[PDB]
Protein backbone atom coordinates (compact mmCIF):
# COMPACT_ATOMS: atom_id res chain seq x y z
CA UNK A 1 0.00 0.00 0.00
CA UNK A 2 1.12 3.64 -0.22
CA UNK A 3 3.28 5.04 2.61
CA UNK A 4 4.32 1.41 3.30
CA UNK A 5 8.04 0.88 2.70
CA UNK A 6 9.54 -1.97 4.74
CA UNK A 7 8.44 -5.58 5.15
CA UNK A 8 8.60 -8.46 7.59
CA UNK A 9 8.13 -12.22 7.67
CA UNK A 10 6.58 -14.51 10.28
CA UNK A 11 9.73 -14.47 12.44
CA UNK A 12 10.18 -10.65 12.30
CA UNK A 13 13.03 -10.41 9.79
CA UNK A 14 13.54 -7.73 7.14
CA UNK A 15 12.66 -9.50 3.89
CA UNK A 16 11.85 -6.50 1.66
CA UNK A 17 12.82 -2.84 1.33
CA UNK A 18 11.72 -0.08 -1.03
CA UNK A 19 14.18 1.84 -3.18
CA UNK A 20 14.11 5.56 -2.26
CA UNK A 21 14.49 7.04 -5.75
CA UNK A 22 12.40 4.61 -7.82
CA UNK A 23 9.96 2.96 -5.43
CA UNK A 24 9.86 -0.79 -6.04
CA UNK A 25 9.65 -4.13 -4.28
CA UNK A 26 13.14 -5.40 -3.41
CA UNK A 27 13.12 -8.85 -1.82
CA UNK A 28 16.10 -9.70 0.39
CA UNK A 29 17.18 -13.34 0.42
CA UNK A 30 20.44 -14.48 2.05
CA UNK A 31 22.94 -16.25 -0.17
CA UNK A 32 23.29 -20.02 -0.04
CA UNK A 33 25.05 -21.82 2.80
CA UNK A 34 25.07 -25.21 4.48
CA UNK A 35 27.12 -27.92 6.09
CA UNK A 36 29.92 -29.99 4.58
CA UNK A 37 30.54 -33.70 5.19
CA UNK A 38 33.65 -35.65 4.20
CA UNK A 39 33.41 -39.30 3.15
CA UNK A 40 36.66 -41.19 3.67
CA UNK A 41 37.93 -44.74 4.06
CA UNK A 42 40.53 -45.52 6.70
CA UNK A 43 43.73 -43.52 6.41
CA UNK A 44 45.68 -46.80 6.39
CA UNK A 45 43.70 -48.00 3.34
CA UNK A 46 43.90 -45.01 0.97
CA UNK A 47 43.92 -41.22 0.87
CA UNK A 48 41.06 -40.46 -1.54
CA UNK A 49 38.02 -38.63 -0.16
Amino acid sequence: LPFQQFGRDIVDTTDAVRDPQTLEILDITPCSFGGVSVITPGTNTSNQV
Binding site: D9, I10, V11, T13, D15, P30
Partner: protein
Protein backbone atom coordinates in the same frame (compact mmCIF):
# COMPACT_ATOMS: atom_id res chain seq x y z
CA UNK B 1 0.61 -54.54 -1.41
CA UNK B 2 -1.45 -53.22 -4.31
CA UNK B 3 0.33 -53.30 -7.70
CA UNK B 4 -1.97 -50.66 -9.23
CA UNK B 5 -0.90 -47.99 -6.73
CA UNK B 6 2.37 -46.42 -7.97
CA UNK B 7 3.84 -46.25 -4.45
CA UNK B 8 3.12 -49.97 -3.84
CA UNK B 9 1.29 -49.60 -0.53
CA UNK B 10 -1.60 -51.57 0.90
CA UNK B 11 -5.04 -49.91 0.92
CA UNK B 12 -4.90 -49.48 4.70
CA UNK B 13 -1.40 -47.99 4.46
CA UNK B 14 -2.67 -45.32 2.05
CA UNK B 15 -5.25 -44.12 4.58
CA UNK B 16 -2.60 -43.72 7.28
CA UNK B 17 -0.29 -41.76 4.98
CA UNK B 18 -3.02 -39.28 3.98
CA UNK B 19 -4.12 -38.57 7.57
CA UNK B 20 -1.09 -37.32 9.53
CA UNK B 21 0.28 -34.81 6.97
CA UNK B 22 2.35 -32.58 9.26
CA UNK B 23 7.61 -16.36 3.12
CA UNK B 24 6.67 -19.59 4.90
CA UNK B 25 7.93 -20.53 8.35
CA UNK B 26 10.10 -23.41 7.09
CA UNK B 27 12.27 -21.12 4.95
CA UNK B 28 12.58 -18.65 7.84
CA UNK B 29 14.21 -21.30 10.04
CA UNK B 30 16.60 -22.42 7.29
CA UNK B 31 18.09 -18.92 7.01
Amino acid sequence: PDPSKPSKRSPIEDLLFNKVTLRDLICAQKF
